Every structure is written in structure tokens, then in C-alpha cells.
Amino acid sequence: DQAGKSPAGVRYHGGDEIILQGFHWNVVREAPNDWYNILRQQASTIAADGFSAIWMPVPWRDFSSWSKSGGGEGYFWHDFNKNGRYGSDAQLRQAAGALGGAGVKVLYDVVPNHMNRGYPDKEINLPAGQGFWRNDCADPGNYPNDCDDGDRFIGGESDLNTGHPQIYGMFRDELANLRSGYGAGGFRFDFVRGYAPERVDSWMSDSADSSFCVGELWKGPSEYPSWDWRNTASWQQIIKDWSDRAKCPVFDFALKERMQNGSVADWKHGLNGNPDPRWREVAVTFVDNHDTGYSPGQNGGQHHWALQDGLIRQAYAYILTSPGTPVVYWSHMYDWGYGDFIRQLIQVRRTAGVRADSAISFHSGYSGLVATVSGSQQTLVVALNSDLANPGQVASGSFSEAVNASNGQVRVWRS
């Protein structure tokens, strides 16, 4: 595993990560108080399957509950105590130690934008009237105010002033605590529309400068005011701007938007397909997560923007053979039967030496998506939902078949 920032200082940890999202939405209900135990038992399998990193659930305990129903998943934590719904503090340390010991770096989901302000029994008790909260200031709507330089979560009454020096430092110190005591190799930043991107750069500089970073900016052009250049920008431009200012890789919601709304041919318009390596190498690609996708259990999870059945293998073949940094969803890998296919694709990626900045060229004249990917060791030809017959139609050189699945709807050849 190679470390290192990008030529622009973006914390993509060498560009060679292959990430597992290590939970689904209903874990706290399907495996009560037992998930860290399961992750520890699975650590050697996760490593054998080829993952270099695991995105862990929010480690801060969350005892919220609402009624559709949910709660406890981590995104409405009430303090940093690790004895939450995924397992105990001791069980987390054991899981992180087993994962890191197997070569899987541990990335913690962290939620700075808000906390369960009203929870009656908690270690973090921030009064009103000192500037600790968004709503200490006038709050006319969902946009920055004088106590919060980003957007708000629902009504905003639980949004923290993350730029207040005491609140900034509270998170700074907890990121350091996760690194020194819980084996953190980096962080996944939740709801980054909620606070300044520069604050993520500051947090990482202070507490984990050489670690891996990724932020979730999920905000389409139409959510920006009419005077904001982002209101008429592409999804790529919006998330790339965030990554520039955070010095952090960013989830490729431009690719997700094309997978949900466009054709397979159109998947080339994700951030990870951009011909400028400074653009595509900061993309963190994914098929579904705990929010967009289904989960086992109640209500099928959230499924807010789920990829249809018929495209799952194509989508995994695309992200695992292409630039950017790919993320595999727990339930596709270990619940729903795509594991052997994904295992094969990870081996193909590693054997070809595809990394976050590998070149990718898209070919016209065929149906579907046809791409040539320049790995450090091999060239790949990838044909998804395509009438391409063979790689010699689009590439020079000698090729052999590496993947052929779904009646030829997923084909990969390697040089």
C-alpha cells in the first residue's frame, strides 16, 4: 500500500485504495450490539477479498429513535462515547485492531454538522447563548448564517457552530483520539454541505494530515441560489470545487447521478471519467450506500436513490476497472450474492494496476459503454451493455478475457 497526497495536496492516500463500506443501514437492528464483533470475525475475509480500507459506522453512540422508523445508526449521536448500538468501546478497539492487523485501514464516519442536542443523558452538554449552536444566531432558512457557515440538517435546531473555536477543537481532538486509540487510518466526512470545506482541510491537517479523507457532498445544482455559479454547473464541477477546498477526495455523486438518470453510455460523465487527472483522481466512486441503497431488514432500509437490479454488476465492473477510488457496499458483497463477482473484479483491478489517476478513454460507435483503461501494469478494455465484439475493434495489442458475465453484458479484457 502506497501513501501520499495527490500533486494538488488532496488526501487520496496514494490513489491505490479499494474501500469496503463496512455496514448497512439496519445493522443496529439486525445484529444488536454485535456488529463490531462481526467485523472482527470477518477481518481476515475482508482482507483476503482485496480491500485496502473499511469505512466504519459512526463510532459515536446514538440512542435516537423516531417513527417508517429508525434511530441509533450514528448520524444523530449524542456524545463521543463509543458504547453505542454497534458494540462496546472494547469491541470497537478489537475490531479496529483485527482489521488494521490484516492490512485493512480503518476509516471512521464522522458527523460534525449536528448532534442529538436534546438527549437527556450525555457527556457533551453545550448551553445556548455562547455561539455553540447554529440557532444561537438568527436562522431564516437553509443557508449559512452567523453561527454556521454551511447548510442545516432539517430544521437546524441541532446544527453545531463547527467554526466556533471550542467546537472546532472538540472535533479536532476527537479525530486525534480516533487515530491514537481506535486505529483510524482516515475519515469519511458526513453532510459536508453543512459546514465549510476548508474546515475539513484544517481538521485533517491538525489531526491526521497523511491519512485518507473522503467527504459526502450530496447537493445538486438546483439546490444553490440563482446567483451562485453552482446553480448552472455540472455535478462534477460542484463536487470538484468542494474537494479543492477540503483537500479531500469526494464521493462521485456525478457518477451516481448518471447511473440513476442517464444511460450506461453516459456513465463516462462522472467525475472519475474526467480526462484531467486532477479531476478524476479525487473521485470516490460507489454503487449504493446505506442512504441511497437498500439494506436488509425493516422497510428495506432507506433506498433513497437505489440502483436497479439489472445494472448492479455493470456498475461494479465500471467502478472497479476505472479511475477514482472505488467503494463496495457491504450488502452487495456479503448479503446479496455479488461477492464472487466483485472479488474477481478487485483482482482484475489490482493485477492491471488501475489506480485513481489511471487514464480512461471512451469509444464511440458501439452501444453501451466501451472504455480503454491504462493501468500501471496492464491495459483494460471494458464493455458494458455493449455490442462490441472483441477488444481489437477499439484497442491495439494482444488481449485475453478477464471477465465475462451477465450474458456478455459485462466483459473485461486485459493486455
Question: First and final CA of the chain: distance in angstroms?
Answer: 24
Q: Toward Ca ion, which CB reaches closer, 50 or 301? A: 50
Helices (H), 120-186: 165-181
Stretch that binds Ca ion, among 16-24, 263-271, 359-367, 407-415 (CB under 5 A): 16-24
50 contacts Ca ion (rule: CB under 5 A): no
Q: Nearest 5°: CA angle at 28, between 25 and 34?
A: 130
Residue pair 289/304 in contact (Cβ under 8 Å)? The answer is: no
Q: Is 183 annotated as a binding residue?
A: no
User: Where do we find the cell 472497479?
Assistant: 320
> Which CB sits closer to Ca ion, 14 or 221?
14
Within 10 A of 130 (CB to CB), how many other CB atoms are there? 11
Let me know: does 239 contact 193? Beta carbons within 8 Å.
no
Annotated catalytic residue within 73, 79, 174, 216: 216
Please list the residues that pair with 410 across neighbouring strands: 384, 405
79 known ligand binder: no
238's enclosing H/E stretch is: helix 235-246
Binding mask 137-176 for Ca ion (x = CB under 5 A): -----------x-x--------x-----------------
Judged by CB under 5 A, does residue 194 bind Ca ion? yes
149 vs 108, 144, 145, CA distance in Å? 23, 5, 6
Q: How far is the CB of 223 from Ca ion (least distance, A)?
A: 14
357 makes contact with Ca ion (CB under 5 A): no
Determine if residue 17 is labeled as part of a ligand binding site.
yes
Q: Judged by CB under 5 A, how many residues of this single chain contact Ca ion?
A: 9
E strands, 325-368, are 325-329, 359-362
Query: Closest CB to Ca ion among 19 and 265?
Result: 19
Minimum CB distance to Ca ion, residue 134 (Å): 6
- Decide whether 97 or 103 has the Cβ nearer to Ca ion: 103
* Least separation in angstroms between CB 322 and Ca ion: 18
Strand runs (DSSP E) across 143-267, as ranges?
A: 184-189, 212-215, 250-251
Binding mask 218-247 for Ca ion (x = CB under 5 A): ------------------------------
Contact in structure between 284 and 324 (CB atoms under 8 Å): yes
CB atoms under 10 Å from CB of 365, counted, come to 9
Q: In the stretch 100-129, what mask flags binding to Ca ion with x, by CB under 5 A?
A: -------------x----------------
190 labelled catalytic: yes
Q: Which residue number, 14 or 103, has a Cβ lying nearer to Ca ion?
A: 14
Q: Which of 62, 136, 190, 257 is catalytic?
A: 190
Give the span between the Cα atoms of 161 and 382, in whole angstroms. Answer: 46
Active site residue 121: no
Q: How far is the CB of 137 from Ca ion (least distance, A)?
A: 11
Of 6, 11, 16, 295, which one interacts with Ca ion (CB under 5 A)? 16
Q: Is 2 annotated as a binding residue?
A: yes
Whether 151 has a binding-site annotation, put simply, is: yes
Query: 194-207 burial, b for 16+ CB within 10 Å, e for fewer?
Result: bbbbebbbbbbeeb
Alpha helices in 274-363 (DSSP H): 277-280, 312-321, 330-334, 339-352
In angstroms, the CA 153 to CA 134 distance is: 10
Query: Cα–chain-centroid distance for residue 3?
Result: 19
325-329 and 19-21 strand pairing: parallel
Annotated binding-site residues read 1-2, 13, 16-17, 75-76, 113-114, 148, 151, 153-157, 159, 188, 194, 290, 302
Q: Which residues are catalytic?
A: 190, 216
Positions that interact with Ca ion (CB under 5 A): 1, 13-14, 16, 113, 148, 150, 159, 194
Residues annotated within a binding site for substrate: 75-76, 114, 153-157, 188, 290, 302
Binding-site residue positions for Ca(2+): 1-2, 13, 16-17, 113, 148, 151, 159, 194
